[PDB]
Structures are given as structure tokens and as C-alpha cells.
Amino acid sequence: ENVLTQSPAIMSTSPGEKVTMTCRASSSVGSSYLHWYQQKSGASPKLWIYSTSNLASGVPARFSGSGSGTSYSLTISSVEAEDAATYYCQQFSGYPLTFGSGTKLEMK
Template sequence: EILLTLSPGSLAASQGERVTMTCTASSSIRTSYLHWYQKKPGSSPCLLIYRISTLASGVLARFSGSRSGTSYSLTICSVEAEDVAMYYCQQWGSSPST
């Protein structure tokens, strides 16, 4: 089973700042099945980025995803108030999905 660790656990930013969060896998994820979800208060999680760096439909270009080894990053290049949310990473390249 692959353990995913997301850091930082929380962050504060001012509008317009660039923020990055990193999801580190305990071992290599087969293929590129690492995805990012955004959960806003009172809403269900929605897909933000899939397969490391592809933006889901309707997601603004200020969001981006990248990979370096077993570390996967989500960056918001110019954060807005509407980006206040919980962010989650998920892999399903290796069973079980985590």
C-alpha cells in the first residue's frame, strides 16, 4: 500500500500570492495516476487536476500540477479568496487506491 503525505498540513496566504502544496508517495506510483481534489466548505470534493498535471474541466489556469520523483505538487500561482478549501491528493496507479 502506498502512503501519501501532504504538506504543509495547513497554510495561510494573501491574495495574489503563489502557494504550493506537495504530496509525497512512500514508493513509486505506477503510471501517472495521481490526482488532486478540492473540497470547499459545505460542498463535496471535486476533481481539480488529474494524471499529475491535467486540469479538470472548468478549472482555472492559475492551478497547475507537477511531479519530481515521488513528490507531486499542486501550485496556485495567484491565490484568490475563493480558493479557501481543503485539498487532497489521491493515487490509483497502485492497488489499493489511497
């Protein structure tokens, strides 16, 4: 498998503060083939960032991604109150598709 080690899950972000999280892949992902997902409190996950740079429908422009090959990141310009969720990066290249660990971006 492609083991996607991610940022530490529990981090407390004050509202209106620029925070970011990483996503380290064990193998090389083609950077058009790695996506970021957002799962809210007890709801289903939804696609948030696809091909590590773009944004899905309904995703605010405060979200952005960077990185290629091995290290991938998600960058939030200013965290608002609708951001208390858990984020999973997900490579899509290798036929054993693997999601990352959790990143429960909580509040203070």
C-alpha cells in the first residue's frame, strides 16, 4: 500500500488565524492524483480539494493546497467557525487507494 502519514490529528486553531496541515506519502503521487477531504462532526466526508491545488463545489477560497510528489499540504488563510472538522488527504494513483489519518482541526 501507499501509507499516507499526516499531520497530528488534534490541533487547536483560534478563529481568524492562518493554519495549515501536511500530508506525507510513502510513495510518489502524481500531484494531479491526490485529493483532500473534509468530514464534519459525525457527518459523511465530502471532497474538498482535488488534485492538491483545486477546490470542490462549495469550498471557500480560504482553502488552498501545495506540494507535489511526496509532501502535500492544505493551507487555510483564515479559519472561521465553520471549520471544526476532520481532514483526510487521499492519493488516488495506486490501485490500493489509501486515505490519510485524521486531522481534527478543533477550536479553542
